Design a protein around this ligand. Structure first.
Ligand SMILES: O=c1ccc2ncc(=O)n3c2n1C[C@H]3CN1CCC(NCc2cc3c(cn2)OCCC3)CC1
Ligand SMILES: [Mn+2]
Ligand SMILES: [Mn+2]
Ligand code: NA
Lengths: 192, 484, 482, 192
DNA sequence: AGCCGTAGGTACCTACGGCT
DNA sequence: AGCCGTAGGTACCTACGGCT
């Protein structure tokens, strides 16, 4: 990808790719990172919900393509863990509720198209500090120290426990049937 | 330093966070003031910067920059476009913003870039904001803790139903049509005199929606189902007539279109039908709309074709007739709820009662505080020479304050007001001026206590203020409701 | 329908455009070094109190404010100007203190203006210092609803410190940045010798000093530029050759020429290698980091001559780049090609006027305030009679007139007395009035001393410049090699 | 052009086309106009300087093409006045100095590629009021009344007097030789 | 060439629900 | 269908002069 700012090392075991929302966040991320082991792929805001889209639309989507190209594993039946270019794929959305949404959209894609990647423990969630509308609000050094620096950062490693439950969760939250999603919200929402 | 995060847990917590935020703080209006956050923040920002109707227009970029910095931590395009719609007389039945310059058209043209346009409050918006500084509504912290913002506006007219709402949330959406303000206030008045009023009786005041774009509604059954249940389909039809154009030929002339239909797009659709031979008898199609003429779309009919047949076809096959699917979801006590016409009016009236009660309570606290200060000023002027000498013999404020309080039985606040007094307040007619203000205040205090002592008196005050707004801002029905 | 001659129309419309771009867009003023857009940005920061000691303000608010009040052009022009001012690879002395993504040497843009925040740098305080003490002429804004400065006080020589580049119509400008210590030393020299030569001035100002460091090759281009306003200056990357193990070597670049895009320079080298237009390179990496600074590594094939490869890179890529000096600035509102001495002379003359005007202002204001305090002192001296006079007056007007009659007071003094709060009559407050008055009398005589002696005024200019030099002056970054 | 908002009438004798800077101006213009006889073509800011550009690039430029297509006359040797779709081409750039610049750029194109159009008196200059950054700052009705309404407006008809002088003018002001333009400015500029 | 930096100007991706 | 309206996100035409 043109947008992908790759790292220098060509050894997947030690390389990491950070997915960020766009160029506002990408700029701080590029400046603060350790370019030997840390790649950056800026997205472009809300990504396609693959649970609601048909294959043709998915495979034509630019952000989806760039992620598949960057990962190098292929997708679906053709997925090959051995061809992974990074052993850490780190979701680093902005620290707002919309960042959370984008994270659900990214996890839906990984689950439906690259599930072995999750099983292998290769998918992580960054934990940037709260109070900044976007990473582009942070200085590069502050983003490095709090979020990207392996010495101080706290990553969450994404774990799949029960695949049947996960199937139902993706389907309910992300699928085309509104009613079940509505029922979920009513059953779980804790309001004012 | 790596903890494990279960994918199922993550999905459920992240999604619920998003969904709830869109529901309570983005896409759905509050039942009390009819506003979503972005609109409320826009109007509040206009208020805080004194951008009232009597003042000159302010630059759009300044308004947007201010609202984005202080209250609305989202994209500038969201804020500007919200403000633009509020200024459009084809979007808002009672426009909330007064815009100067290119603010878009019915053809789906956008506004000019925000650097070119300018804006202020409309007169009616003053009524949304009236009494906001008299402790009528609860303020809250802004997103970063550096500002305060209103949780809800006083909303001295029923804005949800007057201007309507449409929003796509998560798990749900809303679609509330606009209404005639005279009708609505009449309905509130009726309700205020009869808690047990029926929907059918309320409909004696509120005949149905009243769109800024006028046009026709077909039948009352969709209206009635919507008002009874919160959901119903309402058939909207363009205003069209058949007329001669010479040499024995005719044309259909359309002068009003359904609410929320894009005129240029509707025209393209008719053109497409003709081109693809899905409709017989049309020989020409022109948009003759102008500032002077108003909306005018002309459909020429082939000599000896039946123009009424063609018109009926057009209603069936294009947006010339369009459905409004009512789905009245609003935030009630911070939760999304499907509401009928009566519930919407009940929540509104209850908000008015609280606003006017709280305003009365505030006015009373303030009047009592001011009475207290004047009692202290009375004492100071009656004993001025001793007051001055007490202050002069004091080294500091603290000493003067303490001495004034012991010697003259003054509170801390009275003593402070005396030390803050300018020498010009010692002129000869000031003592009489204090006495006059004090007498008027005691009377005012009594008037306020009367209101808070009698719920009927409170309620009648609400009715009177609503009546006044109705008489000043109420207007004629635009949309015609025809029997099916 | 009147007729318009095409020739007339073209000449008048074009001249209108051309002149506007010249005097009010692309060219900096000799006195403060600024173009309109930059001046309006900094003025806007000042007027909204966005000083270094206060928190960062939202970029959108700064931009919206500047656009509405002062700068009737596109928001992108305003925001991008402000961004550059915050970039330490663009400005030798950055004028804006930015928080968030403000772009990089690789030509990455700043974040969207909604994300970033900004305030003045400490040195910008010196650009704006005394702007409210009638030091500079204000003018009407574009629509007549505001006032804006024609020029900033500019208490350091900003044109030469930060430089300027601008494309106008019929002409352009290209002024390199300079070391602030060197510049102030040069101003000080000039202030003691109006007849100083360019050559002598160059004993203080060795040449340009780019924020990006690097090397300049030779002095002859510098000398021509300083003498005539025009000259070609050869810039080079800072590059060394070092071992990397196994008998192999690499070229390591740690500084690049001013205004060169690092990523673009690297792609150019990659291209040359790919198209076999350069021999001997086996690898190319940008190892730049926040912690290590700029580091571009070019691996050389074992036993190849790394010096030969380096010289080729200078020939074939921006690793060596020229700066064509073309020192055009607005002098008395007109575009003019100026040499180094003219630039310094206009700057020093601006400082003298600023400090004189500031002195005259401070004096008027001190005398006004002394007059008011004389009124308060009279009132305290006769407080009983003051009170009586006011109490026996039915209106403010009558009280004013009686105070003026009884106590020989001016209208301003009488109004000050009537505005005095009763708390001003406590012991500590009374002493405060007396103390302020005594301090003011001393201040007034200090000011009068300055305005009485041109040499004292000039010395004050020198002292204030010297103070700025000591606080903000820094080391030379660019090395000038013979 | 896609951008072109044409008039009803198909009779060139009574039709007028207004060229405006962009859609900000275009919107007010479209709302204020008389759509029976008044067409509007919004441009996109600064247009190509045809005096400095190569012919291939000229003929590839979208704005140039849109204007040629809308006018219907063809260009150069193929110019045919009889095929004009409008007998008034009205330049209506913003009333700021950049509007003036765009006007000179438009006139350069007309003079070099459609000179008979000028000779025939078909080229006019609108005179919008001066206080507004852009036409999009004006209300539709105020733009109609002051600038577009044939009853009150004051159009300037562009007249070519001396073609040799005009040639030299366009070459000097708009051509690639900077020095003569510089000399013109110095000889004519009246500074404060 | 094609870059530098102030200027004039604009177009599409995505989520989300309901219509039907 | 693809549109309604708040949200996340971004790219490229043009003029102008002087240097390569
Ligand atoms: O017009 C176009 C056409 C194509 C295109 N492609 C990519 C792209 O990014 N853009 C494209 N565009 C446009 C631009 C998008 N536009 C969105 C709005 C933004 N506004 C920023 C802003 C302005 C102001 C703010 C805040 N933010 O506060 C008050 C002062 C004014 C500027 C960029
Ligand atoms: Mn974001
Ligand atoms: Mn313009
Ligand atoms: Na229909």
């Amino acid at each position: 990808p043109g947008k992908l700012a790759d790292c220098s090392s060509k050894s997947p075991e030690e390389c990491e790719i950070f997915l960020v929302e766009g160029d506002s966040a990408g700029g701080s991320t590029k400046s603060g990172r350790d370019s030997r082991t840390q790649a950056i792929l800026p997205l472009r805001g809300k990504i396609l919900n693959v649970e609601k889209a048909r294959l043709d639309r998915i495979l034509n989507n630019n952000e989806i393509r760039q992620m598949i190209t960057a990962f190098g594993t292929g997708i679906g039946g053709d997925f090959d863990l051995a061809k992974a270019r990074y052993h850490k794929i780190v979701i680093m959305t902005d620290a707002d509720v919309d960042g959370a949404h984008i994270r659900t959209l990214l996890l839906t894609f990984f689950y439906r198209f690259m599930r072995p990647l999750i099983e292998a423990g290769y998918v992580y969630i960054a934990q940037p500090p709260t109070g900044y509308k976007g990473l582009g609000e942070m200085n590069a050094d502050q983003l490095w120290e709090t979020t990207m620096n392996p010495e101080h950062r706290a990553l969450l490693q994404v774990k799949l426990e029960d695949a049947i439950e996960a199937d139902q969760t993706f389907e309910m939250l992300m699928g085309d049937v509104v009613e079940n999603r509505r029922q979920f919200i009513e059953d779980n929402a804790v309001y004012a | 330093r790596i903890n494990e995060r279960n994918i199922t847990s993550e999905m459920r917590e992240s999604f619920l966070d998003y969904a709830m935020s869109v529901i309570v703080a983005r896409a759905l209006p509050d039942v009390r003031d009819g506003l979503k956050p972005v609109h409320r923040r826009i109007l509040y920002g206009l208020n805080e910067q004194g951008m009232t109707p009597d003042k000159s227009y302010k630059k759009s970029a300044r308004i947007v920059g201010d609202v984005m910095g202080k209250y609305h931590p989202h994209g500038d395009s969201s804020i500007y476009e919200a403000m633009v719609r509020m200024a459009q007389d084809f979007s808002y039945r009672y426009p909330l913003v007064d815009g100067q310059g290119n603010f878009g058209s019915m053809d789906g043209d956008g506004a000019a870039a925000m650097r070119f346009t300018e804006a202020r409050m409309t007169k009616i918006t003053l009524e949304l904001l009236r009494d906001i500084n008299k402790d009528t509504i609860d303020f809250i912290d802004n997103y970063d803790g550096n500002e305060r913002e209103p949780s809800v506006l006083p909303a001295r007219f029923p804005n949800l139903l007057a201007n309507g709402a449409s929003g796509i949330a998560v798990g749900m959406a809303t679609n509330i049509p606009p209404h005639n303000l005279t009708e609505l206030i009449n309905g509130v008045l009726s309700l205020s005199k009869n808690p047990d009023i029926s929907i059918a009786e309320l409909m004696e005041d509120i005949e149905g929606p009243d769109f800024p774009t006028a046009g026709l509604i077909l039948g009352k059954s969709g209206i009635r189902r919507a008002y009874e249940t919160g959901r119903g389909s309402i058939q909207m039809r363009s205003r069209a007539v058949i007329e001669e154009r010479g040499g024995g030929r005719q044309r259909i002339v359309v002068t009003e279109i359904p609410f929320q239909v894009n005129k240029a797009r509707m025209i393209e659709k008719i053109a497409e039908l003709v081109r693809d031979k899905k409709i017989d008898g049309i020989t020409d199609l022109r948009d003759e709309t102008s500032l002077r003429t108003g909306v005018r779309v002309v459909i020429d009919v082939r000599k000896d074709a039946n123009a009424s047949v063609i018109l009926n076809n057009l209603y069936k096959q294009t947006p010339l007739q369009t459905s409004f699917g009512v789905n009245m979801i609003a935030l009630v006590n911070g939760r999304p709820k499907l509401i009928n016409l009566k519930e919407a009016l009940v929540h509104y009236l209850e908000h008015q009662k609280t606003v006017v009660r709280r305003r009365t309570q505030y006015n009373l606290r303030k009047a009592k505080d001011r009475a207290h200060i004047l009692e202290g000023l009375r004492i100071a002027l009656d004993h001025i020479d001793e007051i001055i000498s007490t202050i002069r013999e004091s080294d500091t404020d603290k000493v003067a304050m303490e001495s004034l309080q012991q010697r003259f039985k003054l509170s801390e606040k009275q003593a402070q007001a005396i030390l803050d007094m300018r020498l010009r307040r010692l002129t000869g007619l000031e003592r009489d001026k204090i006495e006059a203000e004090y007498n008027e205040l005691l009377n005012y205090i009594s008037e306020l206590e009367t209101i808070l002592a009698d719920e009927e008196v409170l309620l009648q005050l609400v009715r009177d203020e609503l009546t006044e707004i109705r008489d000043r801002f109420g207007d004629d029905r635009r949309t015609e409701i025809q029997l099916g």
